[PDB]
Design a protein around this ligand. Structure first.
Ligand SMILES: C=CC1=C(C)/C(=C/c2[nH]c(/C=C3N=C(/C=C4\NC(=O)C(C)=C4C=C)C(C)=C\3CCC(=O)O)c(CCC(=O)O)c2C)NC1=O
Ligand SMILES: *[C@@H]1O[C@H](CO)[C@@H](O[C@@H]2O[C@H](CO)[C@@H](O)[C@H](O)[C@H]2NC(C)=O)[C@H](O)[C@H]1NC(C)=O
Ligand SMILES: *[C@@H]1O[C@H](CO)[C@@H](O)[C@H](O)[C@H]1NC(C)=O
Ligand SMILES: *[C@@H]1O[C@H](CO)[C@@H](O)[C@H](O)[C@H]1NC(C)=O
Ligand SMILES: *[C@@H]1O[C@H](CO)[C@@H](O)[C@H](O)[C@H]1NC(C)=O
Ligand SMILES: *[C@@H]1O[C@H](CO)[C@@H](O)[C@H](O)[C@H]1NC(C)=O
Ligand SMILES: *[C@@H]1O[C@H](CO)[C@@H](O)[C@H](O)[C@H]1NC(C)=O
Ligand SMILES: *[C@@H]1O[C@H](CO)[C@@H](O)[C@H](O)[C@H]1NC(C)=O
Ligand SMILES: *[C@@H]1O[C@H](CO)[C@@H](O)[C@H](O)[C@H]1NC(C)=O
Ligand SMILES: *[C@@H]1O[C@H](CO)[C@@H](O)[C@H](O)[C@H]1NC(C)=O
Ligand SMILES: *[C@@H]1O[C@H](CO)[C@@H](O)[C@H](O)[C@H]1NC(C)=O
Ligand SMILES: *[C@@H]1O[C@H](CO)[C@@H](O)[C@H](O)[C@H]1NC(C)=O
Ligand SMILES: *[C@@H]1O[C@H](CO)[C@@H](O)[C@H](O)[C@H]1NC(C)=O
Ligand SMILES: *[C@@H]1O[C@H](CO)[C@@H](O)[C@H](O)[C@H]1NC(C)=O
Ligand SMILES: *[C@@H]1O[C@H](CO)[C@@H](O)[C@H](O)[C@H]1NC(C)=O
Lengths: 171, 241, 423, 185
């Protein structure tokens, strides 16, 4: 909870920044990414707190500069699949990845941004069918013909037009 | 929530000019608030204890001119212990003394400074598990030598300075000043408050400093600010405790 | 009444709320492997929570689909927005503008802050901003996008309008039948009990009143911002629940600390398990409370969306005889407008005004028989007796075509002797 | 069924105790330290039952809303003819027939869907003389040469008659009025 001058004998490694590491600052262990911070600790403070009680910053005991601590796990992931006993291939939607050119499991071969996240494993088609598997933000997916997962913009309905006239009626 | 000085509380102001001198032993109940308004280095330190005689031991925390010393000794204190300029006229004898070390190297001269009051030095002394915790803040505060004897507006957060393991019972405390050349001391003032167990809400700015605290359970508006976790209250009806 | 007012009023209805999903293993434990195990005993509860949240998220898209996608014929916006003097330009998209929304729709979308995509580098490079969305997502609280974008909802609205401007009420029931807008407005006037000759005689005045009411609607939502308070409350509740979920991670729940790292670093794996189990129970309780309140809000939102779909069917796709269901007054037309997390209905109503006192009689004793009015009431201007329709003063000569004969005139209380014309 | 089976499956949760089985705890521990584990299990299982009851209450509220809508449809679509658009099927509602279903009701809405439309030149009114003629019911249509009056939802043309129309005002005010003749019997 405070700066300390009595410690057990463990080790003193170098600082690893911009990388998810297992840290140990004055006995406080945890995992996260250490980055340089624009925070000024008041010399009686060793750790910082967020709106929760999570330790989001720390004062390095050797070089007295504040380091931010952020979790290295982040970003929503969704799986797009047809049925089991229909196919085994899947498409993965990474909601918080901008792959328009990563934090993805596999780079695949099909990549395009959908405004609901990065879609990997489904090829874009210019056709507009009805929705089969809803992806989000106007994008749907289906298992369509050799069979593959395709992603498309959903169609709102049949295109129509009414021949409006000021002297014609339809009975 | 902890031990805090309540807002707009009854606090006692003690004045010093060339005709009067007031160092009366204030009680130490659940911690005290101390604040000296001073143009020079008059209020040297404090004496903490129960009877302040030689039957029990006492804490002698003071500035000798160049260091801040704390002595937990059993003193035969002189009546009205003072400093005759830089010479400590504090005690006649000191024995059986369990703590004697310096806390900080602070150069504070005993020279008289003419003019008006310049700074306010605010202290919070509280006892936690046998240790005397000291909280300190210094703010520039220009006060004249008449027509007003009030405390400054706004807040100033006191930073935790020391944890002194005095390890003894404290019920009373006494302030000590310097007497110049054994006359009535110069222009100085000190305020003594008493902490109470209260909840309070603190607002931290973007730089991490406390600004604009509020006293929870002072009035129902402050309790509403407490419940809302905010310092802005919109117009409407609010249930309180 | 001797005059009328064409009134256009707004009705703001929430339709959908924000879809959300929760990673329990991210919320209950930060990245602690020691907390990931001993959470395996609580996996059924988290599958239950995610099942409830998935049901809510699917129901939100179902709510949006049932309100706006009533008709699947996307009728094209006409090149001319003037239909017999009625100016439809403010409620239809402007082809000269880059946004494919109406002017009213743009004003509506500017009036909601929409504070609930992101990237890991964006949260990593903006730590000092202390963004609430970053704090939500670092604790496993994600917001899923709606299936229908605002462009598609605006396209559905722009297809509902101009299907009713060119074909009127006849495209929600079968294929669209075109009709001149003046004749369809005469039909709407006939629907509320006003003869259609009033519409044809005052077409310019009625169109001017309609355009002025549309302009009054436009200006009241370039001014006051409290009109969209229901949608803003939906957004604020959905943000406040997630922020409360983030803030509730600081609760100790009876443990020595609310921080898993502090407990793991100070205690070995006989005594850290007790405090970790206390924290797991408390955080699972917080997630369960959040999911339960989300279910309550989803039920309320679904009721509002069902009402909005009923208003779409009965006020936009047809003319409703129900009192105050489609605005105050006699309902003529309704135009939907796409709004964030909801819909805004522009209810065009007929307000009779400028009433005049008239001496009236229930029936007329012209002879031994009695005459009762077919449609309307008997009125007298002091000397002569006329028959007029109820909602507009149009005095007519009392003829045998205007009235009908039923019985003698000695049994009607208030009977008045007057002549009846016979051609 | 899923709610009941989830309630059954949640009995395997340890809830922070040494075991999820009461028999194991009773067999291994005496009644001073089995009590805390049994209390943990009691708290967890009571929480599971409370969660089940809360979700049942929410689902019952949804089911009650659906049943109220179904009763309203029984009153207004089966026991009468509804003028509300799309309340009883798509189209102009004629009649509805209820069918008993497990846990619900199935309504067979008989509706009138007009079809096979034709284009017609139309007019708001007829200027037969100095006065103007407006149709009592339906619209004025023209087959190219002659003018007729027909009902709105079905093409049944007939000649314009003083009984078919009504007179209101002069004919110089109506926009789009055409010139024709009105038969007088
Ligand atoms: C007796 C207790 C006592 C306390 C708690 C104390 C604290 C204290 N005094 C300071 C400065 C100072 N404060 C004082 C004087 C005083 N200020 C006081 O609180 C009092 C009572 C005096 C003395 C009468 C002066 C003159 C300085 C040094 C300023 C300088 O030379 O930079 C500082 C800042 C040191 C720095 O920034 O490096 C601290 C922490 N000083 C003390 O003497
Ligand atoms: C702790 O020790 C380290 C290692 O000796 C100190 O870091 C050195 O500091 C000096 C003086 O500022 C620099 O010239 C060196 O380049 C630093 N070396 C490294 C490897 O960083 C550090 O200052 C010490 N910290 C404290 C608080 O005493
Ligand atoms: C992704 O990056 C591109 C880089 O050009 C940027 O234009 C875009 O706004 C970003 N976001 C999305 C959701 O595509
Ligand atoms: C799909 O449309 C894009 C954008 O217009 C175009 O570049 C691409 O060639 C099209 N692909 C086809 C027609 O296979
Ligand atoms: C203790 O104080 C008393 C007065 O109370 C005094 O007479 C005595 O000399 C003192 N003793 C010492 C050792 O200081
Ligand atoms: C404390 O120690 C100093 C020297 O370090 C000495 O001068 C002083 O008298 C001591 N104080 C006592 C015994 O009270
Ligand atoms: C924080 O400190 C900076 C200088 O480091 C100063 O410019 C800024 O005003 C301070 N912020 C506040 C809110 O006082
Ligand atoms: C009806 O009111 C309008 C608007 O005030 C006015 O222009 C018009 O003359 C009125 N009509 C009658 C018949 O009074
Ligand atoms: C409709 O109103 C807009 C402004 O609200 C105006 O620019 C436009 O000319 C109007 N249309 C007609 C046909 O008068
Ligand atoms: C009708 O008569 C009543 C009673 O005399 C009077 O108060 C009212 O103003 C009249 N209404 C008119 C003239 O519109
Ligand atoms: C009532 O209206 C008739 C219309 O023919 C008129 O002749 C008569 O003078 C009116 N009576 C009044 C205003 O008292
Ligand atoms: C109408 O009311 C008046 C005033 O009370 C009364 O004299 C008269 O008899 C009433 N007429 C009828 C037909 O009830
Ligand atoms: C009516 O006219 C329009 C416009 O010329 C044309 O598209 C349509 O096919 C015609 N026939 C029918 C039956 O709607
Ligand atoms: C229109 O109908 C009339 C009456 O049946 C008929 O004589 C005439 O030939 C028709 N005209 C056309 C163009 O079909
Ligand atoms: C109908 O529209 C046409 C084409 O703009 C125009 O020439 C004609 O005058 C209009 N007829 C009316 C308004 O009766």
């Amino acid at each position: 909870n405070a700066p300390a001058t009595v410690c057990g004998p463990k080790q003193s490694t170098e600082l690893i920044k911009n990388k998810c590491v297992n840290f140990n600052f004055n006995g406080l262990t945890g995992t996260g990414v250490l980055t340089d911070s624009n925070k000024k600790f008041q010399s009686f403070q060793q750790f910082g707190r967020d709106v929760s009680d999570f330790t989001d910053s720390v004062k390095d005991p050797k070089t007295l500069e504040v380091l931010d601590i952020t979790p290295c796990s982040y970003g929503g992931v969704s799986v797009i699949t047809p049925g089991t006993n229909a196919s085994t291939q899947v498409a993965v939607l990474y909601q918080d990845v901008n792959c328009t050119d990563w934090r993805v499991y596999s780079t695949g071969t099909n990549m395009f941004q959908t405004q609901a996240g990065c879609l990997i494993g489904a090829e874009h088609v210019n056709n507009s069918y009805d929705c089969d598997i809803p992806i989000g933000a106007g994008i749907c997916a289906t298992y369509h013909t050799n069979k593959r997962i395709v992603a498309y913009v959903m169609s709102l309905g049949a295109e129509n037009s009414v021949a409006y006239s000021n002297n014609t009626i339809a009975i | 929530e902890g031990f805090f000085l309540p807002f707009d509380s009854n606090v006692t102001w003690y004045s010093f000019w060339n005709q009067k001198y007031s160092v009366a032993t204030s009680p130490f109940g659940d911690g005290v608030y101390f604040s000296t308004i001073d143009k020079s280095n008059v209020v040297r330190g404090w004496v903490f204890g129960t009877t302040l005689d030689n039957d029990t031991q006492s804490v002698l925390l003071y500035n000798d001119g160049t260091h801040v010393r704390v002595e937990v000794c059993t003193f035969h204190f002189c009546p009205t212990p003072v400093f005759s300029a830089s010479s400590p006229h504090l005690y006649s004898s000191a024995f059986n003394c369990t703590l004697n070390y310096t806390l900080a190297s602070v150069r504070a001269d005993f020279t008289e400074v003419d003019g008006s009051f310049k700074t306010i030095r605010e202290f919070v002394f509280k006892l936690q598990d046998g240790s005397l915790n000291v909280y300190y803040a210094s703010t520039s505060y220009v006060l004249a030598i008449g027509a007003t004897s009030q405390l400054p507006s706004g807040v100033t957060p006191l930073v935790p300075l020391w944890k002194i393991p005095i390890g003894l019972n404290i019920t009373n405390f006494k302030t000590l000043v310097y007497l110049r050349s054994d006359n009535t001391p110069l222009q100085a003032a000190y305020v003594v408050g008493h902490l109470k167990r209260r909840t309070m809400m603190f607002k931290y700015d973007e730089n991490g400093t406390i600004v604009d605290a509020i006293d929870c359970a002072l009035d129902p508006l402050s309790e509403t600010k407490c419940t809302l976790r905010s310092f802005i209250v919109e117009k409407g009806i609010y249930q309180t405790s | 009444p001797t005059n009328f007012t064409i009134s256009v009023t707004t009705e703001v209805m929430p339709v959908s709320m924000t879809k959300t999903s929760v990673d329990c293993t991210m919320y209950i434990c930060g990245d602690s492997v020691e907390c990931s195990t001993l959470l395996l005993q609580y996996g059924s509860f988290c599958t239950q929570l995610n099942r409830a949240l998935t049901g809510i998220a699917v129901e939100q898209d179902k709510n949006t689909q049932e309100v706006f996608a009533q008709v699947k014929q996307i009728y094209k916006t006409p090149d001319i927005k003037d239909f017999g003097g009625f100016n439809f330009s403010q409620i239809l998209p402007d082809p000269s503008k880059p946004s494919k929304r109406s002017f009213i729709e743009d004003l509506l979308f500017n009036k909601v802050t929409l504070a609930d995509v992101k990237q890991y580098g964006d949260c990593l490079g903006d730590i000092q901003a202390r963004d609430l969305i970053c704090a939500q997502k670092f604790n496993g609280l994600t917001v899923l996008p709606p299936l229908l974008t605002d462009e598609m909802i605006a396209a559905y609205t722009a297809a509902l309008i101009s299907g009713t401007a060119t074909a009127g009420w006849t495209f929600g029931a079968g294929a669209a039948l075109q009709i001149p807008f003046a004749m369809q407005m005469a039909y709407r006037f006939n629907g509320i009990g006003v003869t259609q000759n009033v519409l044809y005689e005052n077409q310019k005045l009625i169109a001017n009143q309609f355009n002025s009411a549309i302009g009054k609607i436009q200006e009241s939502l370039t001014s006051t911002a409290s009109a969209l308070g229901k949608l803003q409350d939906v957004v604020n509740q959905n943000a406040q629940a997630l922020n409360t979920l983030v803030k509730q991670l600081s609760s100790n729940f009876g443990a020595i600390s609310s921080v898993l790292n502090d407990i793991i670093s100070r205690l070995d794996k006989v005594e850290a398990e007790v405090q970790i189990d206390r924290l797991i129970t408390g955080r699972l309780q917080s997630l369960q409370t959040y999911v339960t309140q989300q279910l309550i809000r989803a039920a309320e939102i679904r009721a509002s969306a069902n009402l909005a779909a009923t208003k779409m069917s009965e006020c936009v796709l047809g003319q409703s005889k129900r009192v105050d269901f489609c605005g105050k007054g006699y309902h003529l037309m309704s135009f939907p407008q796409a709004a964030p997390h909801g819909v805004v209905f522009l209810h065009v109503t007929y307000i009779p005004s400028q009433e005049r006192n008239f001496t009236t009689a229930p029936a007329i004793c012209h002879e031994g028989k009695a005459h009762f009015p077919r449609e309307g009431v008997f009125v007298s201007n002091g000397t002569h007796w006329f028959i007029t329709q109820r909602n507009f003063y149009e005095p007519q000569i009392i003829t045998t075509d205007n009235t009908f004969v039923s019985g003698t005139c000695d049994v009607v209380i208030g009977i008045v002797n007057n002549t009846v014309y016979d051609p």
